[PDB]
Design a protein around this nucleic acid. Sequence first.
RNA 1: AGGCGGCCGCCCCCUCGCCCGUCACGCACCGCACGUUCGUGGGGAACCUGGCGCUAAACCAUUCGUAGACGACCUGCUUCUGGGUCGGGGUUUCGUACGUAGCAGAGCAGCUCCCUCGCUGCGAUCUAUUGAAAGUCAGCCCUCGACACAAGGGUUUGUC
RNA 2: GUACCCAUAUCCGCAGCAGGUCUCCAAGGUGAACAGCCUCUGGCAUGUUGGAACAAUGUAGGUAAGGGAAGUCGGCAAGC
Lengths: 49, 49, 106
Amino acid sequence: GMTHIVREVDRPGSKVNKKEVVEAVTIVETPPMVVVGIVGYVETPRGLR
Amino acid sequence: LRKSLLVQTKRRALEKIDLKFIDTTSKFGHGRFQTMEEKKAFMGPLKKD
Amino acid sequence: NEVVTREYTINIHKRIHGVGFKKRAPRALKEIRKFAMKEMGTPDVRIDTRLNKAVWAKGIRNVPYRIRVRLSRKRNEDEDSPNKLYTLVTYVPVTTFKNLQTVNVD
RNA sequence: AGGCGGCCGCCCCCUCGCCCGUCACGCACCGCACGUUCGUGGGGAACCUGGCGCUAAACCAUUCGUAGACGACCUGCUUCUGGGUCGGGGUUUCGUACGUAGCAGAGCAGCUCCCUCGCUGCGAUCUAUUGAAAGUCAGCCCUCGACACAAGGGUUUGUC
RNA sequence: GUACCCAUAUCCGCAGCAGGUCUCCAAGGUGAACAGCCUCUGGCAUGUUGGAACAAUGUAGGUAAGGGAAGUCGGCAAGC
Ligand SMILES: [Mg+2]
Ligand SMILES: [Mg+2]
Ligand SMILES: [Mg+2]
Ligand SMILES: [Mg+2]
Ligand SMILES: [Mg+2]
Ligand SMILES: [Mg+2]
Ligand SMILES: [Mg+2]
Ligand SMILES: [Mg+2]
Ligand SMILES: [Mg+2]
Ligand SMILES: [Mg+2]
Ligand SMILES: [Mg+2]
Ligand SMILES: [Mg+2]
Ligand SMILES: [Mg+2]
Ligand SMILES: [Mg+2]
Ligand SMILES: [Mg+2]
């Protein structure tokens, strides 16, 4: 889904600076990745094999 | 989620951010409240009790 | 091979969505036939005139949202079909709809 | 873009595994070509025999929506942490349901314990029950509360 | 002469063709009205087909924050 963030901006030389900024921000659920396989590649004169 | 294949500063990457408020209003419609305790404390008792 | 009878609360308002006004009420009948064929298992479904009145009591586009039905499965005789069993769906009226669920009826 | 070659310990034989010399034979098919080859040349269906092993997967159907003109794509299906249908809540949309009662209510009509707001009936609305009632996934979330469902079929697919 | 149709199916138009063809009878409510809408007597199965989904494009209908004709030959269409 998507939410807001009220964010302090530490970027000097702007009207944005030292003020709160509301932004359109997405959320991505990421479960941990279970390692299964190993693949090797050989440099060929047509690419990778 | 792929790592960036080049390194850039640009005064847009590698800045310490400060999160202040992340809203959790009702996205199924127009959101009116933040938390369930705040919603119950604002609306008071109903026929559910 | 059973002769069982169960009541149900079909929700036609959430089984029909995005259907036009001149065809909203006839789709409810095919949906009741599909629900009876899915639950009881036989293809042969016969609904009654009381259920016909209960569906068509408010026109073609103001279909009532929830209908309490009773499904009885019986056998067929006197040069019967290849489907020996058939679901006779009948209508039973009820004032309220809350806290009602599937009830086996003797 | 790999399968033949080199080394060592043994194996059943061969000191003619080749050139120089002697000897006698094997079809000498009597003038005739397409002959000798890397060939135990490549692929397909079967036939009889030994040893070592294998015991599936797609497509339809049904469901699904993150997908669709139709095809196509991503999905679910175990008898126990499976799914579906009801119900329960969470969220939301509209705005306070029917009924009840009122010494609230523009007023009007009727009766007499002639009644110091006397009583009754009609009467737009209002008040309390009332942030009430109603819908809420079919493309929202959780449910181990209740019901049945679950290996149930049709078609096809092998490498000397 | 006396049946029957007198018609979006008995007539004409090559046809069970959104075309054309002369008349009488006329209810209740709202409403000035034989206007428009909903009912009653009386007829009908939606007009030579049904089922599933709601893609592009189209045909008819309705909207859209701010500007109000700046588009277009022209306020064409639509709307007040
Ligand atoms: Mg009402
Ligand atoms: Mg006559
Ligand atoms: Mg005609
Ligand atoms: Mg005509
Ligand atoms: Mg009149
Ligand atoms: Mg009048
Ligand atoms: Mg007249
Ligand atoms: Mg016709
Ligand atoms: Mg506008
Ligand atoms: Mg506007
Ligand atoms: Mg103007
Ligand atoms: Mg001008
Ligand atoms: Mg001009
Ligand atoms: Mg005009
Ligand atoms: Mg307007």
